[PDB]
Design an enzyme around this catalytic site. Structure first.
Site, mmCIF file in Angstrom:
data_model
loop_
_atom_site.group_PDB
_atom_site.id
_atom_site.type_symbol
_atom_site.label_atom_id
_atom_site.label_comp_id
_atom_site.label_asym_id
_atom_site.label_seq_id
_atom_site.Cartn_x
_atom_site.Cartn_y
_atom_site.Cartn_z
ATOM 1 N N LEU A 1 0.830 -1.210 0.000
ATOM 2 C CA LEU A 1 0.000 0.000 0.000
ATOM 3 C C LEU A 1 0.861 1.256 0.000
ATOM 4 O O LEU A 1 0.514 2.234 -0.658
ATOM 5 C CB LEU A 1 -0.950 0.036 1.218
ATOM 6 N N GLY A 2 1.954 1.215 0.753
ATOM 7 C CA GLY A 2 2.885 2.324 0.921
ATOM 8 C C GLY A 2 4.226 1.910 1.496
ATOM 9 O O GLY A 2 4.394 0.786 1.977
ATOM 10 N N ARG A 3 5.199 2.838 1.445
ATOM 11 C CA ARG A 3 6.562 2.599 1.916
ATOM 12 C C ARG A 3 7.111 3.864 2.564
ATOM 13 O O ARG A 3 7.108 4.934 1.948
ATOM 14 C CB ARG A 3 7.454 2.146 0.744
ATOM 15 N N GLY A 4 7.527 3.720 3.820
ATOM 16 C CA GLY A 4 8.128 4.756 4.651
ATOM 17 C C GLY A 4 9.624 4.549 4.774
ATOM 18 O O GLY A 4 10.161 3.567 4.245
ATOM 19 N N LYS B 1 1.847 -3.599 8.903
ATOM 20 C CA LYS B 1 2.953 -2.659 8.839
ATOM 21 C C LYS B 1 4.214 -3.394 9.259
ATOM 22 O O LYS B 1 4.369 -3.757 10.421
ATOM 23 C CB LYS B 1 2.693 -1.479 9.769
ATOM 24 N N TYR C 1 11.405 3.739 7.420
ATOM 25 C CA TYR C 1 11.702 2.538 8.194
ATOM 26 C C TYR C 1 10.532 1.497 8.218
ATOM 27 O O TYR C 1 10.570 0.572 9.038
ATOM 28 C CB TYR C 1 12.170 2.911 9.623
ATOM 29 N N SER C 2 9.526 1.613 7.298
ATOM 30 C CA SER C 2 8.391 0.672 7.251
ATOM 31 C C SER C 2 7.745 0.490 5.876
ATOM 32 O O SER C 2 7.849 1.359 5.022
ATOM 33 C CB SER C 2 7.318 1.069 8.260
ATOM 34 N N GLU C 3 7.055 -0.644 5.680
ATOM 35 C CA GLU C 3 6.302 -0.973 4.467
ATOM 36 C C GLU C 3 4.907 -1.401 4.944
ATOM 37 O O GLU C 3 4.805 -2.171 5.908
ATOM 38 C CB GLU C 3 6.988 -2.100 3.697
ATOM 39 N N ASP D 1 3.384 13.956 13.981
ATOM 40 C CA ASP D 1 3.572 13.737 12.532
ATOM 41 C C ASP D 1 2.255 13.894 11.814
ATOM 42 O O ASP D 1 1.949 13.150 10.899
ATOM 43 C CB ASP D 1 4.320 12.404 12.222
HETATM 44 CL CL1 LIG Z 1 -8.140 15.483 1.186
HETATM 45 C C1 LIG Z 1 -7.269 14.444 2.269
HETATM 46 C C2 LIG Z 1 -6.712 13.290 1.751
HETATM 47 C C3 LIG Z 1 -6.006 12.418 2.575
HETATM 48 C C4 LIG Z 1 -5.460 11.120 2.032
HETATM 49 N N1 LIG Z 1 -4.033 10.916 2.315
HETATM 50 C C5 LIG Z 1 -3.580 9.549 2.035
HETATM 51 C C6 LIG Z 1 -3.566 8.603 3.220
HETATM 52 C C7 LIG Z 1 -2.680 7.423 3.020
HETATM 53 N N2 LIG Z 1 -1.760 7.053 3.939
HETATM 54 C C8 LIG Z 1 -1.198 5.871 3.502
HETATM 55 C C9 LIG Z 1 -0.235 5.029 4.049
HETATM 56 C C10 LIG Z 1 0.087 3.873 3.349
HETATM 57 C C11 LIG Z 1 -0.534 3.574 2.137
HETATM 58 C C12 LIG Z 1 -1.493 4.422 1.595
HETATM 59 C C13 LIG Z 1 -1.827 5.583 2.292
HETATM 60 N N3 LIG Z 1 -2.756 6.583 2.003
HETATM 61 C C14 LIG Z 1 -5.860 12.748 3.917
HETATM 62 C C15 LIG Z 1 -6.415 13.903 4.440
HETATM 63 C C16 LIG Z 1 -7.144 14.777 3.629
HETATM 64 C C17 LIG Z 1 -7.762 15.973 4.270
HETATM 65 C C18 LIG Z 1 -6.966 16.982 4.815
HETATM 66 C C19 LIG Z 1 -7.533 18.023 5.536
HETATM 67 C C20 LIG Z 1 -8.904 18.092 5.697
HETATM 68 C C21 LIG Z 1 -9.707 17.116 5.141
HETATM 69 C C22 LIG Z 1 -9.144 16.063 4.435
#
Ligand SMILES: Clc1cc(CNCCc2nc3ccccc3[nH]2)ccc1-c1ccccc1
Ligand SMILES: Clc1cc(CNCCc2nc3ccccc3[nH]2)ccc1-c1ccccc1
Lengths: 325, 324
Positions: B44-47, B67, B49-51, B152
């Protein structure tokens, strides 16, 4: 096998609702911080719970906190989902919050406060009108929860909180409550011995909301006759024998034959043969002021082996016994 | 005599009044189950220090998120687990379901409830921003009340299932327990979301850091400018903030806490006027902006960490009057 059965009322209420409503296993519980509550004192103690009086320190209001021993997580999700679905219903205990203590992580349910009056102290002071009044209040709660597709499955005096000064009644302890789905086979190990319907005692699993109407009949019989409990069994098998000593063994066999029920062999040596008794036989000098032809007719229509013939909560509310409320 | 001390305006002593078992993660005993119950489906994703993987619990056929952590620092893994166990079940907090290790690799893995992430921004309405901002605030007021700072907060750490209007705050690897008077490492959060306290190396920060990061996310959503403060390094990040908040209030902040500004700021900081929030309104974002949104943003994006709204104060703001 046994003949199938379904509820005469609210049969398909859950079938016509999305899964979100009745699928408690999929329900996401959000546990708040119990720091918002300060425990004051212990009120009661159950097999898997401990009830405390508490204070919400954000608004200085008294609450009741039910700390649950997490013996079964599915059972906790079920209770929470049912309480959330019934939240605000007439005479249903109001779930105010769901919290966990930060260090213990023990599940806790927070409810509206109820100033309960003692069962023994109320027993001797209650008039005929009071009995009708509070029986009607429990029926409001049952007709509501049955209409919401839920069987309480644990009706008894301990699960009815009353604030007599304020004429306020709450049906509590929904831990054994379940969603009614027509044709579903349920666990018969529910409720409390004295209040168990014959369907549970003969292991007939396809029961419904009518189980609650049996339990309500047992409570009514104890109140009007001042005999607590009314059916005093010493174990689950003996419980059926105590009912048989009043209702008769003839109608018990008609019931088990109508539903093709297999009677457990443990009944062989204890069941015997018993005649059907008249409700008038339980009237005495100590209770005659609580008994009336209307009360006996109403009781006769609740305490029946055949779960399908018992009055529904809505039919019960239309009974002449309640004309004065 | 060095920087002036500071403490949180809310939940100041929540950890002080709890036994060491709650916050002493170094002493926490982690019990690692068998990862054989889970079959990895896809990445799904890669950080750093994590996958993060989507997976299937083969005992109940339910999807989960796994994770897998690179064990670069065992103390950091114990910290994350302890925080996740502490917050387990809290509103909009990712739920830790299990802690496992693969029998052959022995790599630490955390198993979470599944979240079905929508791609998304172009489709979000004024109402949707208010709704999701309120959901993040429920998560932050809860974790702050539990004596934890996320450290974070950013869009990548917010998972949203838009179809079900479900939001989860994830990635607690940088989270820490708040203890009043404690000096923390400022090398936290992600550049665009770092609070000015981190950029000026003021170590005695608190939950209010998360409210700055939340203000950055709000500015980026309502103004459709991603990121809002686009620094190219940690020093330049403070300059991007000063180009909006102005340098007069920055000097008031550093003087209030007797902060020594790093000499690396000397040639780049310059002099900047305080901008009006209305200056960021344009034809592309005017449908997301309102006087209430700008007033709320102005109360989050302040240099002084103590003046920022707390999560509970933020929830009472008029910008949220239209949400349940
Ligand atoms: Cl529009 C929006 C979009 C997202 C989506 N971010 C992707 C999350 C993700 N993490 C991940 C980890 C691993 C793998 C996939 C991942 N996807 C988050 C917050 C908002 C937002 C911000 C402020 C107010 C209202 C909404
Ligand atoms: Cl059903 C009933 C109940 C009671 C009092 N029962 C409270 C038991 C209780 N207290 C509690 C404290 C703490 C926790 C659980 C508790 N459960 C008194 C009278 C009646 C009654 C009802 C209808 C008509 C006439 C009488």
């Amino acid at each position: 096998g046994p003949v199938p059965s379904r509820a005469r009322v609210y049969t398909d209420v859950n079938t016509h609702r999305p899964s979100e409503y009745w699928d408690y296993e999929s329900h996401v519980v959000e546990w708040g911080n119990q720091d918002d509550y300060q425990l004051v004192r212990k009120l009661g103690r159950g097999k898997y719970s401990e009830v405390f009086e508490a204070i919400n320190i954000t608004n200085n209001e008294k609450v009741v906190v039910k700390i649950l021993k997490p013996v079964k997580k599915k059972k906790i999700k079920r209770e929470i989902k049912i309480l959330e679905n019934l939240r605000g219903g007439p005479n249903i205990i109001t779930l105010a919050d769901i919290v966990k203590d930060p260090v213990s992580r023990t599940p806790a349910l927070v409810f509206e406060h109820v100033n309960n009056t003692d069962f023994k102290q109320l027993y001797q002071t209650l008039t005929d009108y009071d009995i009708r009044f509070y029986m009607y209040e429990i029926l409001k709660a049952l007709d509501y929860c049955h209409s919401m597709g839920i069987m309480h499955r644990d009706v008894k005096p301990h699960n009815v909180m009353i604030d007599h000064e304020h004429r306020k009644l709450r049906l509590i302890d929904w831990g054994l409550a379940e969603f009614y789905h027509p044709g579903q086979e349920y666990n018969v190990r529910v409720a409390s011995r004295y209040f168990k319907g014959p369907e549970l005692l003969v292991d007939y699993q396809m029961y419904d909301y009518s189980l609650d109407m049996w339990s309500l009949g047992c409570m009514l019989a104890s109140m009007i006759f001042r005999k607590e409990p009314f059916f005093h069994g010493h174990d689950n098998y003996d419980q059926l024998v105590r009912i048989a000593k009043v209702l008769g063994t003839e109608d018990l066999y008609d019931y088990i034959d109508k539903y093709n029920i297999e009677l457990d062999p443990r009944f062989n040596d204890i069941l015997g043969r018993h005649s059907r008794k008249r409700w008038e036989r339980f009237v005495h000098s100590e209770n005659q002021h609580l008994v009336s032809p209307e009360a006996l007719d109403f009781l006769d229509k609740l305490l029946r082996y055949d779960h399908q013939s018992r009055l529904t909560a809505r039919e019960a509310m239309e009974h002449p016994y309640f004309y004065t409320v």
